[PDB]
Design a protein around this ligand. Structure first.
Ligand SMILES: [Ca+2]
Ligand SMILES: [Ca+2]
Ligand SMILES: [Ca+2]
Ligand SMILES: [Ca+2]
Lengths: 144, 103, 51, 51, 103, 51
């Protein structure tokens, strides 16, 4: 009722003859895709995400702080530890996200976490649960 | 388009790396495993085959078994995908009746 | 039933009121490539989820 | 109806005690793998007589 | 589009020249024979017909037999494509019961 | 489609994609392939229905 193995990656030949051989193909196999790599990526996205020289158009609070405060509202009144993980505990108030001193500790984690929230189709299924509260933030990112 | 080689309605990387099912309001959502958004709830992390429609080879998919769209007479400990679900039937004999066919 | 019997490990346990309780848990046959596609099963995890 | 034996064969059996059993042919089916759901299903139409 | 005249899901040049099913991850991948890697792993080089869906003509494809998507009651030495898989059934007779139909 | 009108095509007969119990001299298309069956009788058993 369908085609069996449509990848058709057989035509590609792998060399690297010798001890400790490492093969890297656009298809991604062996050391390319694995659960440990995904776990490492999760640690990477959570703190100091992106090791590249330069990233996206925005790391400042001049245009990206008011939107974050506006977006910081939960209809279900949940999102405990689910959001600001490892933030010397979720603040009960924090006076509505406008103070920097003794608070910039988690601001870097929060901006890095935002990139992690909507990266590839999979994360969208996870972020699909957030429904409207996250979508609003995702729509602004999509407009770019 | 995310792949599901086992064609059981659940993608392959989730069955490999761990996943769970969680209701939000009245709706079941198939999440991948997050230890900071599930473990607190007591949800059980699930792993199964990316190429077996039924990883335990019983006539029930992985997705039906984690979703609950199954015959409910299946025992709850058999609702895990790595736990097989099958009947064990044996017959006992309580009584004999012999009749002498003598006229 | 023979598909289940040839692919699982069988564990019988009688600590619940001295009654033989049988459970089959999917475990990997290394010589079968399709069977190796399952996640690994330790004994303690099996005893946790099965009993 | 049960198997029937007449008189002379009965006498010859109780004399010689030679009663042998032959296996002429065996009917039986193949179950094939399904690529749809992995379930191996019996085709009642096909038999090993073909094969 | 690579040809597979035997329509068994595995192309013809691989069945001619040798191939092996080695899984780098949980998912199963079939590929051409390379002696530098697969020989060190102990993988068995496989050859079969490019025009036979079942090279041993048993009711199981070459691909099912090398993949493992088969009835698992097949013996492991019959998992090679050049090895036939078939039942051998014969009946033994343990006991006679004769009853004299005399009234 | 079958030049010998037997239930096998010309192409199946020259290719070999046929029931292999066909004799090799019947693998030519101008040679017919058909069974010839007749029954022999090795033994009689009569039983007198007398009580
Ligand atoms: Ca799946
Ligand atoms: Ca599966
Ligand atoms: Ca082929
Ligand atoms: Ca073939």
């Amino acid at each position: 009722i369908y085609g069996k193995d449509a990848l058709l990656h057989e035509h590609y030949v792998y060399a690297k003859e010798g001890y400790c051989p490492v093969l890297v193909i656009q298809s991604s196999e062996d050391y390319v895709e694995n659960t440990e790599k995904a776990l490492n990526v999760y640690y990477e996205i959570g703190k100091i995400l992106s090791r590249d020289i330069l990233s996206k158009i925005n790391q400042p609070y001049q245009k990206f702080l008011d939107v974050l405060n506006t977006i910081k509202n939960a209809s279900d009144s949940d999102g405990q530890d689910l959001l600001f993980t490892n933030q010397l505990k979720e603040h009960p108030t924090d006076f509505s996200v406008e103070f920097l001193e003794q608070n910039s500790n988690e601001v870097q984690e929060v901006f890095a976490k935002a990139f992690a929230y909507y990266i590839e189709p999979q994360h969208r299924d996870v972020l699909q649960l957030y429904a409207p509260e996250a979508f609003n933030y995702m729509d602004k990112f999509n407009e770019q | 388009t995310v792949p599901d080689r086992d064609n059981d309605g659940i993608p392959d990387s989730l069955e490999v790396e761990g996943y769970t099912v969680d209701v939000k309001n009245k709706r079941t959502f198939l999440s991948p495993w997050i230890s900071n958004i599930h473990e607190k709830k007591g949800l059980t992390k699930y792993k199964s085959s990316p190429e077996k429609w039924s990883t335990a080879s019983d006539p029930y998919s992985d997705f039906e078994k984690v979703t609950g769209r199954i015959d409910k007479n299946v025992s709850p400990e058999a609702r895990h995908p790595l736990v097989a679900a099958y009947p064990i039937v044996h017959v006992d004999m309580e009584n004999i009746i012999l009749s002498k066919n003598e006229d | 039933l023979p598909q289940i019997q040839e692919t699982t490990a069988r564990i019988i346990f009688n600590g619940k009121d001295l009654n033989l309780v049988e459970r089959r848990i999917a475990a990997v046959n290394p010589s079968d490539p399709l069977e190796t596609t399952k996640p690994d099963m330790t004994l303690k995890e099996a005893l946790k989820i099965a009993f | 109806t049960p198997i029937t034996m007449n008189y002379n064969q009965f006498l010859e059996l109780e004399k010689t005690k030679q009663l042998r059993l032959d296996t002429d042919q065996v009917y039986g089916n193949i179950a094939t793998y399904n690529f749809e759901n992995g379930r191996v299903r019996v085709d009642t139409g096909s038999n090993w007589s073909e094969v």
